[PDB]
């Protein structure tokens, strides 16, 4: 309707999650061990194919180096290493579920601990798995530094020197950022703290009950395992020769006759390596796009407040906290959701003494008998004085203008 508006009278603090892969397994390959083995006759026929193998080693090595740059680009956002204060009091807010606990030897938060107990679910033929440069303990130190900097400083440590500020004032700043005045937070400080604490508690049970929560991190673990198993099982395929064993056909066959049999096995096993390497190159490109996005969310939702809609969680963004998972990262988005709306009647302008009046920051509203001006996100009526309106015009052109009294 063209004279009816609805305005909320209450809010709600909600916490969600977000899971993103950041890196995958690093691998290396060896041609002669995989293709020929210890047979010297085979290795002499292989060198006639040129520099196929040098290309394969270059491709896998390039991927391995890129994985280490993916992790360094997401977590190594801080030059310093900040530490949490000894006394954990933040004006009613509880952070015990995200800060590290010294009792555990690895110093991991309770939420970070159960993540490692879910997604966690020698050599064969020269295929080796290389270890990541940054250990799990080193990664958690970066996460702890980010958490301890966004609690005692806010967003100031992401642009220069870190400046301390009491936590409620930071929340008041963020309320101003989303568009609600300061007095809302201070007059409801106790209620808001209780709402946030309840939201944190549900996170642990949400991941416990839901089986398919860490499904995106689980896929990369299984996909890399399937490719290696498929590659190894290709060593027992005839490909068109008498047998699948190099020295078995070496003995019971004519030396020139055996030459063409080795040719079939070599060509078949070269084609298997090409399929594997090409598959990894495409997957590595897909992971890199995911790692680039996680680096942007870390810089824009954690080290600051973002006004991009639906980028750092559904609702109006307030802050965020990072948590580390194997081969990935988890975000905890804290947002602001309105509730308990109500009918109202509105007008575009107020006419008084032949002059029009428009609100400064607010929308005119009427409860049936009296006209008030209120902010457009929380019902808080005020009297229509001249300190919250500007005249700027005449009472003749605006359509739908009503007339009332303005108290100077």
């Amino acid at each position: 309707s063209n004279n009816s508006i609805a305005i909320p009278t209450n809010f709600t603090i909600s916490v969600t999650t977000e899971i993103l892969p950041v890196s995958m397994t690093k691998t290396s390959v060896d041609c002669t061990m995989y293709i020929c083995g210890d047979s010297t006759e085979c290795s002499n026929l292989l060198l006639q194919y040129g520099s196929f193998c040098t290309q394969l080693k270059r491709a896998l090595t390039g991927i391995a180096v890129e994985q280490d740059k993916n992790t360094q680009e997401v977590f190594a956002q801080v030059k310093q290493i900040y530490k949490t204060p000894p006394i954990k009091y933040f004006g009613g807010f509880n952070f015990s579920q995200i800060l590290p606990d010294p009792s555990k030897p690895s110093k991991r938060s309770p939420i970070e601990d159960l993540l490692f107990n879910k997604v966690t679910l020698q050599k064969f033929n020269g295929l080796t798995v290389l270890p990541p440069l940054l250990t799990d303990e080193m990664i958690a130190q970066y996460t702890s530094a980010l958490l301890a900097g966004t609690i005692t400083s806010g967003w100031t440590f992401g642009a220069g020197p870190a400046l301390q500020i009491p936590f409620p004032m930071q929340m008041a700043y963020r309320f101003n950022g989303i568009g609600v005045t300061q007095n809302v937070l201070y007059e409801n400080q106790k209620l808001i703290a209780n709402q946030f604490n309840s939201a944190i508690g549900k996170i642990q049970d949400s991941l416990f009950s839901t089986p398919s929560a860490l499904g995106k991190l689980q896929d990369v673990v299984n996909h890399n395992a399937q490719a290696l198993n498929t590659l190894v099982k290709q060593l027992s395929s005839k490909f068109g020769a008498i047998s699948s064993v190099l020295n078995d056909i070496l003995s019971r066959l004519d030396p020139p006759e055996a030459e063409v049999q080795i040719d079939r096995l070599i060509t078949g096993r070269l084609q298997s390596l090409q399929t594997y390497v090409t598959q990894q190159l495409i997957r590595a490109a897909e992971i890199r796009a995911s790692a680039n996005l996680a680096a942007t969310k870390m810089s824009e939702c954690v080290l600051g407040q973002s006004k991009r809609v639906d980028f750092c969680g559904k609702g109006y963004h307030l802050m965020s906290f990072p948590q580390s998972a194997p081969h990935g990262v988890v975000f905890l988005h804290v947002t602001y959701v309105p509730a308990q709306e109500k009918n109202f009647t509105t007008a575009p302008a107020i006419c008084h003494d032949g002059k029009a009046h428009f609100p400064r920051e607010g929308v005119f509203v009427s409860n049936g008998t009296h006209w008030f001006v209120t902010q457009r996100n929380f019902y808080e009526p005020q009297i229509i004085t001249t300190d919250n309106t500007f005249v700027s015009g005449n009472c003749d052109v605006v359509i739908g203008i009503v007339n009332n009294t303005v108290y100077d």
Binding site: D68, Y82, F124, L130, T135, Q141, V232, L235
Partner: protein, 136 residues
């Protein structure tokens, strides 16, 4: 069962056999192998190098050095502070200080190498950053 001969794993590779002379079951494990890396500074600066044996124990390498390894390009020997064992492999040719600097040449799980000042190649633990604490 008293009619089978040899066992196979999931990927169809032999891992157990039975002796035909006396009926007894034996296990089969492949002989060790892995990659080899060379850590060097600028050849415009020095000629010393450090060798990394990827994914192998230090005792296995030392035992096999007695004329049983397929790479005659061996280092000098275990001259005290040369054999340092990391989670990536048996690093030979570098001395492990207990200080911490920023990484210069990546090696493995948190270990880096650099040419510091006599002159020698040293291996340390990567330093995350300068510590700080905000008075809240």
């Amino acid at each position: 069962l008293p009619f089978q001969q040899f066992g196979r794993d999931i990927v169809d590779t032999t891992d157990a056999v039975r002796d035909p002379q006396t009926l007894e079951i034996l296990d089969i494990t492949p002989c060790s192998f892995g990659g080899v890396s060379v850590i060097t500074p600028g050849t415009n600066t020095s000629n010393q190098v450090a060798v990394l044996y990827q994914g192998v124990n230090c005792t296995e390498v030392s035992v096999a050095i007695h004329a049983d390894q397929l790479t005659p390009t061996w280092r000098v020997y275990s001259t005290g502070s040369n054999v340092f064992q990391t989670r990536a492999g048996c690093l030979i040719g570098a001395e492990y200080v207990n200080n911490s600097y920023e990484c210069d040449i990546p090696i493995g799980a948190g270990i880096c190498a650099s040419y510091q000042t006599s002159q020698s190649i040293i291996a340390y633990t990567m330093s995350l950053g300068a510590e700080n604490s905000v008075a809240y």
